[PDB]
Design an enzyme around this catalytic site. Structure first.
Site, short mmCIF file in Angstrom:
data_model
loop_
_atom_site.label_atom_id
_atom_site.label_comp_id
_atom_site.label_asym_id
_atom_site.label_seq_id
_atom_site.Cartn_x
_atom_site.Cartn_y
_atom_site.Cartn_z
N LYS A 15 0.83 -1.20 0.00
CA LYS A 15 0.00 0.00 0.00
C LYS A 15 0.87 1.25 0.00
CE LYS A 15 -4.58 0.60 0.18
NZ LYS A 15 -5.50 -0.32 -0.54
N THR A 67 -4.24 -5.61 0.94
CA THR A 67 -3.64 -4.27 1.01
C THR A 67 -4.46 -3.31 1.89
OG1 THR A 67 -4.64 -3.40 -1.04
CG2 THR A 67 -2.51 -4.55 -1.24
#
Length: 269
Positions: free
Chosen positions: A5, A49
Site C-alpha cells: 500500500k 492491502t
C-alpha cells in the site's frame, strides 16, 4: 516480487513528546512537543492491502514512542510477527512537518501549542528494510533523511542548491530515540547544513557537501556515514551592474541542473 500500500496518510495528535535530547551548538533544537504529527507511509512486502492500511493506522494509535523511525520499527516487527508467509518488508515514512504559529495571550507574544502551519518546505523521511532470518528479525537497511532543503547564499553569482541529506547509525537502536541523547534529529542536521555554507567562503558544491558531512559526523559519533543528493539551481544574471546599489538582478534559468551523489564515511573525517 512484492506488493503493498502507498499514500497511507496517518495523523496522530498528542504523541509522546521527544525530550532529553543532546543539544548541539549549531542548532536551537531541544526536542519535539509532538502535539500533532503527520506521516505518509509506503508499505511493501515480499483485500490484503486494505488490511495493511488499517494495520499501519491503528499501530500509529498504539505506538508509545517519540519518533517516525521507531514507529516504522514497531510496524515492521509487528507485521513480521503476525503474518507468517511474509519474509521481507520495506517501510518508508515521509514526515508531514507541522510548525507552531504565534499567539497573543495575556498581553504577551508567544508560540502556540494549538495552532500549527502545515509546512511544504524541507521534510524528514525514514526508510526501514527488515527480513526474516531465520528465527530472528534482521534489519537489512535503515536510514533517515532530510529532503528538499533549498538554500541560496548571496555573495555579501549566488549559489542556489537543493540538498537531500541521509545518515545511517552504527547502532540501529539509536535511531528510535528511546535513549534520546543518541538520536540524530533532522532539525539539527538541517541547521548544521546552513551553519556550514554560511562560514565557507565561495565554496564549490562537492566541497560544500564534503564539509557538511564531516561536520555532521564530528557532531554525531553515532553515525557511520552521511550521504548527499545535491542539485545546482543557480540563477542567470540579467543586470550585472546597478548604479548606487550593491546588488544585481537575476532570473530563472533553463531546466537543466547539475547534480552530485556523494557519501562522507567515518574514515573520511
Amino acid at each position: 516480487m512484492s506488493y503493498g500500500k502507498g499514500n497511507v496518510f496517518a495523523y496522530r495528535t498528542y504523541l509522546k513528546p521527544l525530550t532529553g535530547v543532546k543539544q548541539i551548538p549549531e542548532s536551537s533544537f531541544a526536542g519535539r512537543d509532538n502535539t500533532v504529527v503527520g506521516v505518509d507511509v509506503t508499505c511493501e512486502i515480499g483485500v490484503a492491502t486494505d488490511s495493511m492500511k488499517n494495520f499501519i493506522q491503528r499501530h500509529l494509535a498504539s505506538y508509545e514512542g517519540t519518533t517516525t523511525e521507531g514507529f516504522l520499527h514497531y510496524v515492521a516487527h509487528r507485521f513480521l510477527d503476525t503474518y507468517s508467509h511474509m519474509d521481507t518488508i520495506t517501510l518508508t515514512g515521509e514526515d508531514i512537518p507541522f510548525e507552531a504559529m504565534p499567539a497573543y495571550e495575556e498581553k504577551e507574544l508567544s508560540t502556540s501549542r494549538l495552532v500549527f502551519r502545515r509546512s511544504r518546505n524541507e521534510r524528514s523521511r525514514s526508510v526501514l528494510k527488515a527480513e526474516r532470518s531465520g528465527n530472528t528479525i534482521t534489519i537489512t537497511e535503515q536510514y533517515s533523511e532530510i529532503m528538499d532543503l533549498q538554500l541560496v547564499k548571496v555573495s555579501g553569482r549566488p549559489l542556489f542548491v537543493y540538498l537531500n541529506i541521509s545518515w545511517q547509525y552504527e547502532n540501529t537502536n539509536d535511531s528510535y530515540a528511546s535513549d534520546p541523547a543518541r538520536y540524530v534529529a533532522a532539525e539539527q542536521v538541517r541547521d548544521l547544513a546552513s551553519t556550514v555554507f554560511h562560514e565557507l567562503e565561495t565554496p564549490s558544491i562537492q566541497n560544500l557537501i564534503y564539509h557538511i558531512g564531516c561536520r555532521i559526523l564530528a557532531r554525531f559519533p553515532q553515525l557511520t556515514d552521511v550521504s548527499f543528493q545535491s542539485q545546482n539551481h543557480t540563477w542567470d544574471t540579467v543586470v550585472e551592474e546597478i548604479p548606487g546599489s550593491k546588488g544585481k538582478v537575476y532570473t530563472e534559468p533553463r531546466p537543466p541542473y547539475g547534480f552530485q551523489h556523494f557519501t562522507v564515511t567515518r574514515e573520511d573525517a
